[PDB]
């Protein structure tokens, strides 16, 4: 039954869309659950600042990481999977209506490409927007020493992160994967557009 | 078999009801299990007050959070999924009775729209009630410093929360999702009512 | 296959029995695993008494909670699901015997209502018994300060519980659900009895 | 498919064997995973003795509990499920051989009751043996204060257990369940033996 | 479908091979996941030596246990399941080739016993090799007091293990199971060899 | 259904490819989830250096392990499974196109070996590249004493690892498995190439 269901969902799509779904499944969803989630396991437990003031660790950790990268990548992978599901539901409803019309009439370039172009444009726009936001907030490296200058701590305090090399490696890896997806969408659009 | 079962459950519904079920599944149930649950992981472990009195942390944490937002959203998502299931069970029983009457007679605007309107009204009422309760209790922001004035602590004590920016972001996100659902229900009601 | 199996288990029952099974599944089993289990997560870790005697915390925590509410509700939900399963197995065996007699004879008010009445009476009796036991042991509120008077501690010691508001809310919620089930069983009995 | 498989495994057995399988599933396997496992969660973490000698806690905890009750009940539930599976595999092989002989000959009181009696006798023997062992080692109660007299601790030390009331309740509960099973096996044997 | 798949995998094998597969599944894989894994849960957390030198605990724990028994039993259960899978894949390929030859010719003592003998010999050899290795490294008991004589600790230090009785019981239990399997393989070989 | 699906995925492949898939599944994916993951459980919790400077442990642990071996093996097992999936998807699309041409024409040495050779060459290249990287970074042993010379610690500090024998054993084991796979790929290539 599983095989048949798979056929039903992915049997009517482009080959570049198929390899995009492959790089979505085997390289993003598989990587996020297996290995990169445990690297952000002991985030707040190993974060250690250098003072004796009670509660300076919480405000300095909050000012260091406004949002952890795992939940940011989860929101990124949710907001780029919605238009594909919308296009699939629309083409499923249209295929069902045309099949019903075929069954009722056997007993007696259009909206699809428009929705396809719209879905591809929204996917590329959300990808480049999330890349610009991540470049604006964090950069693409983590230093082992962070300087904190927030109340109620005294003037300046030093805090030390937890394993800042492995997270740098995984940040660069997800950046490479997102750039590959952004290039592949434009490749697919120019492959489908110049056949007119 | 899975595909067939899905057809059986969702093949007789409105398209706005279909996109409401989509925003129920992919945006509420998927978001609650994956990312936002781990943000409320170390709630009571990282909560730290500034005193030496034994047991002031427990009473100040209790007075700060009367109920955590995760269980509140779980009760919200339970109390708005009951009338949809009731409508589906009622239309399933009516469809089974009409199919049995059709099978026994082949060998020889009404209650449905009423229940549909009732289910939509109860869904919108429970949504706006839970929004008013959450606006009354917490507001829509978390400050990093909380002042506690409860026995057996001395006069006033300061307590520091854990990562109050990320929880503010997720609170605003769930507020936007609930407002979108509340608008979509009224859109569906006015779409189905003016066809008379 | 799943759908068919469901049909097989629940296709021959009363409609009040169907909504009782609905309030059993979606309101008791679903609520116990999702949200209310994590509220009793850090029970013994956050329980803190006010002394320096080694081991007073264990005996005072034992005298405070003779049995936690989660395991008590699990025993309550087990002891009220046995007679329904017994009635279903009995009617399945009787239906199989009558179907075998029909197949062997096509090639050529009674015990059921008695067992139904017995199952409903045992369900209501166990419900009111567990409610009386929970009213006798704990009451329906948790105070934030408990006084302990047990050896080997000195004369009287104070202990502070962990988040006593949220547990009060969930205790009141499960009480309301159990009272609704107890009323619904009597409603079903009077609905099925006055048709004679 | 599930339903059919269930039919295949349990369609040829005695009714007392059916209710024995019911009390095996819903009362032993279901109870061990859900509630009683979490009661033995923080066993060695909350065990606290009264001294300053390093390492006295480990030897006194070892002399207190030679084997925890959870693993003892797991071994008990394994050693009483083997003869039922052996009888089922034997009757499956005999049914397959007789069905093959029937298919090869349509184209042209004995060993079963012996194995049934042997399986019932071995089940009752292992039940009463495990009950005698548990009565010999622990008794049927846990005191909150234990006296330890083992090297390298000094002369006598006091140790305090963790929640000794709840474990007493569950020990008495499993004792009642095992006595009910032991009585039911003898009831089934005398029900099947006096029909000769 | 499950039932059919099971038939497909185990329908062509010896009865002693069937009871060997039974003692492989219900007594090794079932026992390792359920109960004996939690006994080695807090291994390094409860291991406590008697000194104040920083880092003596790590080197003394390393010299005490070169490899924990759980991973050793996992490697033992992997290295004795490979030849059975190899024999099954070989007989599956040979059965497929003979079935293809039968289908292409209906439209118009040998290698198997050799591989069977080879698989049984390799299984018995790896079993007795792992038993000799475990007898050489650990013995078959754990003492509660271990003497450590390794740098950078001072001259001799005492360390105390965690619950050394329960692990002794489980070591003796797995030894009995492995000896039963080693005897059963030779019984199966002499049962299949003297029929010539 | 499962069996059929398995047939569909693996019924058209080489026998050396089949035993390569066997050594991929039963020896890499099975070993990584069961036993070797728990050995790297308490990595940063048991790592202990010998100083009193706050935060020297984080920078010395970061300089010791730039990336843990578990995530490195996960990236290794991902980057060698992509060309097999690409070859399978390509031969599936070609088989579907040829089957469609056969169905449309019944109603009225090439690209495959090229892709096979390309997939085998890329697999062997990525294997030897990951082996060279692991030989360059870590070596194939872990010492129990590591010397750290990084700011903001003083001149030289000693740090002690956690269980450095078991990790050495598992590193040697995965090295042996990878060398066996690298030899088997060349064996398969020379077996398929000299048949011309």
d(CA F132, CA B33) in angstroms, rounded, equals 40
Inspect the interface and report whether the beta carbons of B162 and A70 lie closer than 8 Å. Answer: no
E80 close contact with D: CB closer than 8 A:
no
Between CA F124 and CA F185 the distance in angstroms is: 7
Listing DSSP states for D115-130 in one string gives: HHHHHHHHHHHHHHHH
Does F47 touch chain A if contact means CB atoms closer than 8 Å?
no
- Chain D residues whose CB is inside 8 A of the E36 CB are 71
- Is the Cα dihedral F97, F98, F103, F107 positive or negative? positive
DSSP D148: E
Taking each helix axis as running N to C, give the angle between helix F82-106 and helix F111-137, from 0 to 180 degrees, rounded to the nearest 10. 170
**Residue F1 contacts E, CB cutoff 8 Å:** yes
Nearest CA in chain B to A32: B34
Contacts of C129 (CB under 8 A, 6+ apart): none
E3, E22, E166: residue with CB nearest D5:
E3
Question: Who's near F128: CB < 8 A, 6+ residues apart?
Answer: F182
C-alpha to C-alpha distance for E80 and E125, rounded to whole angstroms:
9
Asked if F180 and F16 touch (Cβ cutoff 8 Å), the reply is: no
Provide the token pair at F117: 């050779």
The residue numbers preceding gaps of C to N over 2.5 A in chain E are 108
- In a mutational test of the C interface, the residue from D2, D4, D34 whose CB has the highest number of chain C CBs within 10 Å is D34
Angle between helices E15-24 and E166-193 (to 10 degrees): 170
| C72's tokens | 């008590």
Element (H, E) at D145: strand D145-148
Strands A145-148 and A157-160, bridge-based pairing:
antiparallel
* Contact across the interface for D22 and C85, Cβ inside 8 Å: yes
- Region at C55 (left for phi over 0; alpha for psi -120 to 50; beta for the rest): left
CB–CB contacts below 8 A, A to F: 62
* Cα–Cα distance measured from residue A189 to residue B9, given in angstroms and rounded to the nearest whole number: 36
Q: F16 at the E interface (CB within 8 A)?
A: no
Beta-carbon count within 10 A of F17 CB: 19
C-alpha distance from B5 to closest chain C C-alpha (Å): 6
Residues of chain E found within 8 Å of residue D138, distances taken between Cβ atoms: none
Please judge whether D163 and C44 are an interchain contact, meaning their C-beta atoms are less than 8 angstroms apart. Answer: yes
Do F103 and F154 meet the contact criterion of CB atoms below 8 Å apart? no
Residue F145 pairs in a beta bridge with F160
Per the CB < 8 Å rule, is F93 touching A15? yes
Nearest to D69 by CA among D184, D180, D186, D178: D178
**Looking at beta carbons, which residues of chain F come within 8 Å of E78?**
26-27, 30-31
CB contact under 8 A, C144 and B59: yes
How far apart CA C6 and CA A18 sit, in angstroms, is: 36
- Using CA atoms, how far apart are residues E176 and E129, in angstroms rounded to an integer? 16
Q: How many CB pairs under 8 A join E and F?
A: 61
Mutate to test the interface with C, among B33, B44, B60, B71 (most CBs of C within 10 A): B71
Q: State whether A160 and F67 contact (CB < 8 Å).
A: no
Q: Which chains does F contact via 3+ CB–CB distances below 8 A? A: A, E
Q: Decide if B180 touches A, using CB distance below 8 A.
A: no
Touching subunits of C (3+ CB pairs, under 8 Å) are: B, D
Query: E14 and E188 in contact (C-beta within 8 Å)?
Result: yes
Find, in chain E, the residue whose alpha carbon is nearest to that of D67: E166
- How far from D121 is each of A91, C5, D189, CA to CA, in Å? 65, 36, 9
Determine, for residues C70 and D36 on separate chains, whether the beta-carbon distance falls below 8 Å. Answer: no
Phi, psi of E43 (to 5 degrees): -85, -60
Residue B38 corresponds to which tokens in the numbers above? 């781990």
* CB contact at 8 A, D12 and D190: no
CATH class of B1-194: mainly alpha
d(CA C58, CA C47): 10
Chain E residue numbers with beta carbons less than 8 Å from the beta carbon of F15 are 93
Burial, C161: exposed, middle or buried (Cβ in 10 Å; 0-12, 13-18, 19+)?
buried
Instruction: Provide the 3-class DSSP secondary structure of residue F184.
Output: helix
d(CA C86, CA B123): 37
Interface check for D196 against chain C (CB to CB < 8 A): the answer is no
In whole angstroms, give the CA distance from residue C124 to residue C183: 9
Spell out the SS3 assignment of A61-78.
HHHHCCCCHHHHHHHHHH
Length of chain E: 196
To the nearest whole angstrom, how far is the Cα of D60 from the nearest Cα of chain E? 9
CA distance B157 to chain C (A): 18
Instruction: Name beta bridge partners: E145.
Output: E160
- Which chain D residue's Cα is nearest to E23? D82
Q: Does E166 touch chain D (CB under 8 A)?
A: yes
- β-partners of residue E157 are E148
Task: Please indicate if any CB of chain A lies within 8 Å of the CB of F163.
Answer: no
User: F166 to chain E: nearest residue by CA?
Assistant: E67
Chain-chain contact of B71 with C166 (C-beta, under 8 angstroms): yes
**Residue E90 CB-density burial (10 A; 0-12 exposed, 13-18 middle, 19+ buried):** middle
CB atoms within 10 A of CB E11: 8
The answer to whether the beta carbons of residues D182 and D173 sit under 8 Å apart is no
**Secondary structure (3-state) at D157:** strand
Chain B residues close to C162, C-beta within 8 Å? 44, 58
Full DSSP string of B125-151 = HHHHHHHHHHHHHT-S---SEEEE--T
Where does residue F72 rank: exposed (0-12), middle (13-18), buried (19+ CB within 10 A)?
buried
Yes or no, beta carbons of E78 and F30 under 8 Å apart = yes
Query: How many angstroms separate the Cα of E43 from the Cα of each of E54, E152, E166?
Result: 19, 22, 13
Nearest residue, CB atoms, B3 vs list A4, A62, A71 = A4
- Dihedral over alpha carbons D177, D183, D185, D188 (to 10 degrees): -130
Spatial CB neighbours of A14, under 8 Å, sequence gap ≥ 6: A188, A192
Minimal CA separation from B134 to chain A, in Å? 23
Cα–Cα nearest to C167, from C147, C144, C142: C142
Domain boundaries, chain B: 1-194
As given in the structure block, the two tokens for residue A56 are 């300076």
Contact between E78 and F26 using a beta-carbon 8 Å cutoff: yes
- The nearest alpha carbon in chain C to D34 belongs to C74
CA angle A192, A193, A194 (to 5 degrees): 100
CA A95 to chain centre: 29
Nearest to E67 by CA among E130, E16, E109: E130
Three-state secondary structure call for residue B59: helix
For residues B119 and C16, what is the distance between their CA atoms, to the nearest angstrom? 20
Vertex F141 angle, CA F140 and F147, to 5°:
125
Tokens 């007594």: give the residue.
E27
Nearest CB to C166: which of B66, B89, B93?
B66
Contact B161, B48 (CB under 8 A): no
Q: Where are the alpha helices (DSSP H) in D68-165?
A: 69-79, 82-106, 111-137
Half-sphere exposure of F52 (CA within 13 A, CB side): 0
Counting Cβ atoms within 10 Å, is residue F4 exposed (0-12), middle (13-18) or buried (19+)?
middle
B31 interaction partners in chain A (CB closer than 8 Å) = 78
Chain F residues close to E65, C-beta within 8 Å? 163
In whole angstroms, what is the distance from residue D173 CA to residue D170 CA? 5
At C115, list the tokens.
Answer: 């067992």
């Amino acid at each position: 039954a599983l095989g048949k269901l798979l056929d039903k969902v992915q049997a009517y799509s482009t080959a570049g869309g198929k390899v995009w779904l492959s790089v979505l499944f085997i390289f993003r969803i598989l990587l996020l659950g297996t290995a990169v989630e445990s690297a952000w396991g002991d985030e707040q437990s190993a974060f250690r600042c250098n003072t004796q003031q009670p509660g300076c660790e919480n405000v300095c950790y909050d000012k260091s990481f406004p949002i952890s990268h795992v939940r940011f990548w989860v929101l990124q992978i949710i907001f780029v999977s919605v238009p594909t599901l919308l296009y699939l539901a629309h083409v499923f409803y249209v295929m069902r209506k045309e099949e019903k019309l075929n069954k009722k009439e056997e007993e007696l370039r259009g909206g699809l490409l428009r929705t396809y172009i719209i879905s591809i444009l929204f996917k590329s726009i959300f990808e480049v927007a999330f890349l610009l936001i991540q470049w604006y907030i964090y950069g693409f490296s983590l230093s082992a020493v962070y300087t904190c200058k927030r109340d109620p701590c005294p003037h300046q305090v030093d805090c030390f992160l937890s394993r800042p090399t492995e997270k740098t490696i995984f940040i660069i890896f997800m950046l490479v994967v997102s750039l590959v997806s952004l290039a592949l969408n434009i490749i697919e659009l120019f492959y489908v557009f110049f056949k007119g």
